[PDB]
Amino acid sequence: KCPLMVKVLDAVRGSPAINVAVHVFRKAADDTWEPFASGKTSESGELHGLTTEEEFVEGIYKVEIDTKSYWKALGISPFHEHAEVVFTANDSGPRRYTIAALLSPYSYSTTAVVTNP
Amino acid sequence: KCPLMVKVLDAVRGSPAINVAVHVFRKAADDTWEPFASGKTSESGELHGLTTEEEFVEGIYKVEIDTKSYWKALGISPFHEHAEVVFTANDSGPRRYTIAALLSPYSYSTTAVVTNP
Amino acid sequence: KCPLMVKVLDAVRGSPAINVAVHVFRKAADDTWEPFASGKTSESGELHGLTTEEEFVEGIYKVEIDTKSYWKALGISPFHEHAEVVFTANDSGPRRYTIAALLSPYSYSTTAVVTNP
Amino acid sequence: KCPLMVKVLDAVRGSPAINVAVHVFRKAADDTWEPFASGKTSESGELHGLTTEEEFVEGIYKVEIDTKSYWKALGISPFHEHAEVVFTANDSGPRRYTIAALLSPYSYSTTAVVTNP
Ligand SMILES: O=C(O)CON=C1c2ccccc2-c2ccccc21
Ligand SMILES: O=C(O)CON=C1c2ccccc2-c2ccccc21
């Protein structure tokens, strides 16, 4: 949406990774992971609309990209259960975050692009 | 060294990532993460001797590489709290699991190299 | 533009890589590299308008991303002279190609996203 | 093994990339690429003994990893012709150069690990 976007690419096919489930959690006061938002990537491999400026407060967030479910639906047995992307957000004020992930059956890469709006 | 090894490289300095704390967890029947093994990477960026064949049974494992503290010790501002690598140990495949992680302040990749002696 | 786009990210700063020079070559009949197109990445780290559907014929192309010039302008001494991305294009008909590159001082990654228009 | 080593991993199969042809060139005074050294990766994905301290003088070097043929031998359709790694050898820094390449059909990364004995 505005504050948090996720974009996933498939390194085997050289294509957007479509229909990839994404779960976002936020660390609570008791140090447990509270469900914060979720969704799926579109045809373009992008997931917009996860949250709002209002809801996306300071905190430690975990973005779980369900890579195994993605590869299995393509008849592939991958190594990882999911990608995890854990980071502190907005601790110097609001930012826009794009979490990019590149997927291969035994590997993935991830990159944060952080903009000041 | 044997069943499980972790190797970490620093993409900013073109070096092994030395003295990086690494924690391994095993998923418990109640879906909590139980501490399993840990250590710090060597001068060569490697962490050997985390577990044994006997101890390393099939199951879901999480490897956390404490990248934020690594970068902070170098006076470099990082994005991630840590790199996570989550996977299922399988007895069908090759016997050796090497988790390799390539670190940048706002990006990391990880690959699993699964081999036989 | 339409047929060939280049997008570059900075893994140290978690930002688009701005003002990155890009040179594209095409292998000639005599197996030498003919200059084909060039440009620079914009504020968004993207380079559009390199070529047209008419000019972008079948062939072997080389996309040179001038990473050393990029890092030097930021006071950094990197390892690589430039990224090279060499590939056969349009050998099964016209496609759209996006060449993505992620830059660190001692490392880079690249990924092709290929669409059928 | 000594001054220059090349190591290659397969991100699709989670293995060393075996029997991969690797060519090293040195830039000549007329900006042509002169063949310098070559070989094929071992069972461990490594290529040692390319050059000697005596032979490996300062200059610009290009390492070409013949990835297209690697993937074709596995019946996997690749994007790149080859992976290129271009850099300047420097006597000021550490004495050992390890070029590591992580391969996917439509993506590759490469990092330089520059160390001392
Ligand atoms: O994830 C990584 O760090 C590797 O690069 N991934 C990129 C990615 C993923 C999804 C959408 C766009 C990208 C992208 C764009 C430019 C450079 C690198 C990347
Ligand atoms: O981390 C990744 O998956 C990217 O590649 N990483 C490699 C790595 C990390 C630590 C130690 C050795 C490596 C390595 C060796 C050859 C090819 C790729 C890689």
DSSP string across chain B: --SEEEEEEETTTTEE-TT-EEEEEEE-TTSPEEEEEEEE--TTSEE--S--TTT--SEEEEEEE-HHHHHHHTT---SEEEEEEEEEE-SSS-SEEEEEEEEETTEEEEEEEEE--
Q: Which residues are bridge partners to D6 per DSSP?
A: D47, D99
The answer to whether the CB atoms of D13 and A106 lie below 8 A apart is yes
Beta bridge partners of B104: B107
- Please, which contacts does A42-46 make with residues 24 or more away whose CB atoms are closer than 8 Å? A42/A18, A43/A16, A43/A18, A44/A16, A45/A7, A45/A8, A45/A9, A45/A10, A45/A15, A45/A16, A45/A17, A45/A18, A45/A20, A46/A5, A46/A6, A46/A7, A46/A16
Separation of alpha carbons C111 and D105, rounded Å = 9
3-state secondary structure of A68: helix
Judge: A11–D11 Cβ closer than 8 Å, yes or no.
Answer: yes
CA-based max dimension of chain B = 44
Q: Using DSSP bridges, classify how beta strands C4-10 and C15-16 pair: parallel, antiparallel or unpaired.
A: antiparallel
Answer whether B102's CB lies under 8 Å from B6's CB: no
Contact A49, A68 (CB under 8 A): no
Rounded CA-CA distance A56/A63 in Å is 13
Structure tokens at C53: 């559907």
Residues of C in contact with A112 (CB under 8 A): 14
What are the Cα distances from residue B42, in Å, to B53, B89, C60? 22, 24, 44
Question: CA of D20: how far to CAs of A22, C114, D40, D46, in Å?
Answer: 36, 25, 5, 9
Chain breaks in chain B (C to N over 2.5 A) after: none
Tell me the backbone φ, ψ of residue C70, rounded to 5 degrees: -70, -50
Strands C59-65 and A80-89: unpaired
* Cβ atoms C87, C60 nearer than 8 A: yes
* A13 contacts on D by Cβ (under 8 Å): 105-106
- Answer whether A117 touches C (CB < 8 Å): no
Nearest CA to CA, how far is D114 from chain B (Å)?
6
Q: What secondary structure letter does DSSP report for D32?
A: P
Quick one: tokens of D82? 């080859």
Which residues in chain B have their CB less than 8 angstroms from residue A84's CB?
Answer: 84-86
> At D108, which amino acid appears?
Y
d(CA C44, nearest CA chain D) in Å: 22
Report domain extents, chain A. Answer: 1-117
Could you give the dihedral angle defined by the CA atoms of residues C12, C16, C21 and C24, in that order, rounded to the nearest 10 degrees?
110
Chains B, D: CB contacts within 8 A come to 32
Q: Do B97 and B116 meet the contact criterion of CB atoms below 8 Å apart? A: no
Q: How is domain B1-117 classified at the CATH fold level? A: Immunoglobulin-like (2.60.40)
Q: Which residues of C76-94 are buried (b: 16+ CB within 10 A; e: fewer)?
A: eebbbbbbbbbbbbeeeee
Side chain identity at residue D64, one-letter code: E
Q: Smallest Cα–Cα separation from B113: which of D1, A67, A104? A: A104
In eight-state DSSP terms, residue D45 is S
Among C110, C44, C8, CA closest to A96: C44
**Atom 18 in ligand 2: which residue has the minimum CA distance?**
D102
Q: How do strand C107-115 and strand D107-115 relate by DSSP bridges?
A: antiparallel
Q: What is the dihedral of CA B88, B93, B95, B101, to 10 degrees?
A: -50
Ligand 1 environment, Cβ below 6 A:
A 7, 9, 100-102, 109-111; B 107; C 7, 9, 100-102, 109, 111
Atom of ligand 1 nearest to the CA of C101: 17
Name the phi and psi angles at D72, rounded to 5: -65, -35
Q: Identify how the structure was determined.
A: X-ray
Q: How far is CA C12 from the centre of its chain?
A: 19
| CB pair distance less than 8 Å for B12 and C106 | yes
Token output for C43: 């504020």
Do the beta carbons of residue B33 and residue B41 sit within 8 Å?
no
Q: Rounded to whole angstroms, how far apart are CA atoms D79 and D81?
A: 7
CB contacts of C102 in chain D (<8 Å) are 109
What does the alpha-carbon distance between residue D81 and residue A34 come to, in Å, rounded to a whole number? 46
Q: How far apart are CA B66 and CA B22, in angstroms?
A: 6
On whether any CB of chain A is under 8 Å from the CB of C109, the answer is: yes
Cβ(A6)–Cβ(A50) below 8 Å? yes
DSSP code of residue C58:
S
D5 SS3 class: strand
Measuring CA to CA, which residue among A79, A76, A83 is closest to residue A41?
A: A83
Q: Phi/psi at C16 (nearest 5 deg)?
A: -60, 150
Distance B111 CA to ligand 2 centre (A): 7
Virtual torsion, Cα B47, B49, B50, B52, nearest 10 deg: 150
b/e sequence A12-36, b meaning 16+ C-beta within 10 Å: bbbebbbebbbbbbbbeeeeebeeb
Distance CA C83, CA C102 (A): 10
H/E/C letters for each residue in A12-41? CCCEECCCCEEEEEEECCCCCEEEEEEEEC
Q: Closest-CA residue in chain C for D79?
A: C87
